[PDB]
Design an enzyme around this catalytic site. Structure first.
Site, PDB file in Angstrom:
ATOM      1  N   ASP A   1      -0.200   3.405   0.540  1.00 36.58           N
ATOM      2  CA  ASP A   1      -1.321   4.210   0.069  1.00 36.58           C
ATOM      3  C   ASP A   1      -2.348   4.514   1.177  1.00 36.58           C
ATOM      4  O   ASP A   1      -3.294   3.752   1.399  1.00 36.58           O
ATOM      5  CB  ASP A   1      -1.995   3.482  -1.106  1.00 36.58           C
ATOM      6  CG  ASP A   1      -3.045   4.329  -1.808  1.00 36.58           C
ATOM      7  OD1 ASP A   1      -3.406   5.415  -1.304  1.00 36.58           O
ATOM      8  OD2 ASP A   1      -3.525   3.888  -2.875  1.00 36.58           O
ATOM      9  N   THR A   2      -2.181   5.636   1.866  1.00 37.32           N
ATOM     10  CA  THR A   2      -3.078   5.949   2.982  1.00 37.32           C
ATOM     11  C   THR A   2      -4.520   6.234   2.532  1.00 37.32           C
ATOM     12  O   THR A   2      -5.437   6.235   3.349  1.00 37.32           O
ATOM     13  CB  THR A   2      -2.579   7.156   3.796  1.00 37.32           C
ATOM     14  OG1 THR A   2      -2.513   8.322   2.956  1.00 37.32           O
ATOM     15  CG2 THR A   2      -1.207   6.849   4.377  1.00 37.32           C
ATOM     16  N   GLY A   3      -4.707   6.482   1.241  1.00 38.22           N
ATOM     17  CA  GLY A   3      -6.035   6.761   0.709  1.00 38.22           C
ATOM     18  C   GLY A   3      -6.772   5.505   0.299  1.00 38.22           C
ATOM     19  O   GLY A   3      -7.904   5.556  -0.192  1.00 38.22           O
TER      20      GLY A   3
HETATM   21  C1  LIG Z   1      -2.248  11.785 -10.839  1.00 39.29           C
HETATM   22  O1  LIG Z   1      -2.940  12.085  -9.628  1.00 39.29           O
HETATM   23  C2  LIG Z   1      -3.734  11.103  -9.108  1.00 39.29           C
HETATM   24  C3  LIG Z   1      -3.920   9.883  -9.785  1.00 39.29           C
HETATM   25  C4  LIG Z   1      -4.731   8.878  -9.248  1.00 39.29           C
HETATM   26  C5  LIG Z   1      -5.437   8.976  -8.029  1.00 39.29           C
HETATM   27  S1  LIG Z   1      -6.416   7.694  -7.350  1.00 39.29           S
HETATM   28  O2  LIG Z   1      -7.442   8.217  -6.509  1.00 39.29           O
HETATM   29  O3  LIG Z   1      -6.889   6.852  -8.395  1.00 39.29           O
HETATM   30  N1  LIG Z   1      -5.337   6.798  -6.353  1.00 39.29           N
HETATM   31  C6  LIG Z   1      -4.092   6.187  -6.949  1.00 39.29           C
HETATM   32  C7  LIG Z   1      -3.819   4.680  -6.595  1.00 39.29           C
HETATM   33  C8  LIG Z   1      -4.986   3.711  -6.803  1.00 39.29           C
HETATM   34  C9  LIG Z   1      -2.602   4.152  -7.374  1.00 39.29           C
HETATM   35  C10 LIG Z   1      -5.151   7.178  -4.905  1.00 39.29           C
HETATM   36  C11 LIG Z   1      -5.785   6.141  -3.902  1.00 39.29           C
HETATM   37  O4  LIG Z   1      -5.452   6.452  -2.596  1.00 39.29           O
HETATM   38  C12 LIG Z   1      -7.367   6.096  -4.020  1.00 39.29           C
HETATM   39  C13 LIG Z   1      -8.085   7.367  -3.479  1.00 39.29           C
HETATM   40  C14 LIG Z   1      -9.595   7.156  -3.380  1.00 39.29           C
HETATM   41  C15 LIG Z   1     -10.373   7.059  -4.545  1.00 39.29           C
HETATM   42  C16 LIG Z   1     -11.752   6.848  -4.537  1.00 39.29           C
HETATM   43  C17 LIG Z   1     -12.485   6.706  -3.349  1.00 39.29           C
HETATM   44  O5  LIG Z   1     -13.849   6.500  -3.338  1.00 39.29           O
HETATM   45  C18 LIG Z   1     -14.361   5.405  -4.107  1.00 39.29           C
HETATM   46  C19 LIG Z   1     -11.706   6.789  -2.162  1.00 39.29           C
HETATM   47 CL1  LIG Z   1     -12.559   6.618  -0.646  1.00 39.29          CL
HETATM   48  C20 LIG Z   1     -10.322   7.003  -2.178  1.00 39.29           C
HETATM   49  N2  LIG Z   1      -7.852   4.929  -3.319  1.00 39.29           N
HETATM   50  C21 LIG Z   1      -8.326   3.762  -3.884  1.00 39.29           C
HETATM   51  O6  LIG Z   1      -8.516   3.566  -5.070  1.00 39.29           O
HETATM   52  O7  LIG Z   1      -8.591   2.757  -2.953  1.00 39.29           O
HETATM   53  C22 LIG Z   1      -9.319   1.595  -3.297  1.00 39.29           C
HETATM   54  C23 LIG Z   1      -8.745   0.412  -2.504  1.00 39.29           C
HETATM   55  O8  LIG Z   1      -9.265   0.579  -1.170  1.00 39.29           O
HETATM   56  C24 LIG Z   1     -10.574   1.144  -1.235  1.00 39.29           C
HETATM   57  O9  LIG Z   1     -10.745   2.228  -0.339  1.00 39.29           O
HETATM   58  C25 LIG Z   1     -10.961   3.450  -1.068  1.00 39.29           C
HETATM   59  C26 LIG Z   1     -11.257   3.059  -2.522  1.00 39.29           C
HETATM   60  C27 LIG Z   1     -10.723   1.650  -2.678  1.00 39.29           C
HETATM   61  C28 LIG Z   1      -5.217  10.215  -7.394  1.00 39.29           C
HETATM   62  C29 LIG Z   1      -4.423  11.239  -7.889  1.00 39.29           C
END
Ligand SMILES: COc1ccc(S(=O)(=O)N(CC(C)C)C[C@@H](O)[C@H](Cc2ccc(OC)c(Cl)c2)NC(=O)O[C@H]2CO[C@H]3OCC[C@H]32)cc1
Lengths: 99, 99
Positions: free
Chosen positions: A25-27
């Protein structure tokens, strides 16, 4: 390997002697895994995602083998929709995005 | 190009003439953008991540340029902190994750 994205980039990981499946998960800044027992001491922490914030257990300096590559670092444990491998460990296995 | 994961993999995107920053996100099935007014029909959707679910508006066949690479497909719009480029568009620009 070179991982394409037509399907979810799910890989097998080994942690605490157990095999599990996780999403590359690069995000994600951090690695977050579903509820499980892990050896060391842990600290309460909060992390936020798209839906808001959750309480996690922070374990430091934990060994994880990710698709055959060793990383040793922080793992958060709590109510995530799926096991996610974040940049804190993706950087350790030398992962990059290219296009 | 080769995008490092030492930092968040943010790149410039263009949608509807608007220039924004967005995360190249292998862990996102779909592309989710911060709240913005787009013309056209849409469909209600809920998507889930670490804090639970949010309600978004689903727009189909939307043109998005990603770091100079054109792509077209579904974009979700709602109350996210960050713009997220998901696998539905990453595949269109030939992005892979390599290690
Ligand atoms: C159906 O289409 C989609 C469904 C879900 C998502 S998601 O953003 O929830 N997510 C899915 C994953 C948790 C299974 C993508 C993920 O990369 C997300 C993006 C993001 C979502 C919200 C953000 O701001 C709060 C950021 Cl910076 C990235 N990152 C994330 O939740 O990361 C957690 C764990 O590490 C931290 O760093 C970033 C947030 C914390 C996106 C698209």
């Amino acid at each position: 390997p070179q991982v394409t994205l037509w399907q979810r980039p799910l890989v097998t990981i080994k942690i605490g002697g157990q095999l599990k499946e996780a999403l590359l998960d690069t995000g994600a800044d951090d690695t977050v895994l579903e509820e499980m027992s892990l050896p060391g001491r842990w600290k309460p922490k909060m992390i936020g995602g798209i839906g808001g914030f959750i309480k996690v257990r922070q374990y430091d300096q934990i060994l994880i083998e990710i698709a055959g590559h060793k990383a040793i670092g922080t793992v958060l444990v709590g109510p995530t929709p799926v096991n996610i491998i974040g940049r804190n460990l993706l950087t350790q296995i030398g992962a990059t995005l290219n296009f």
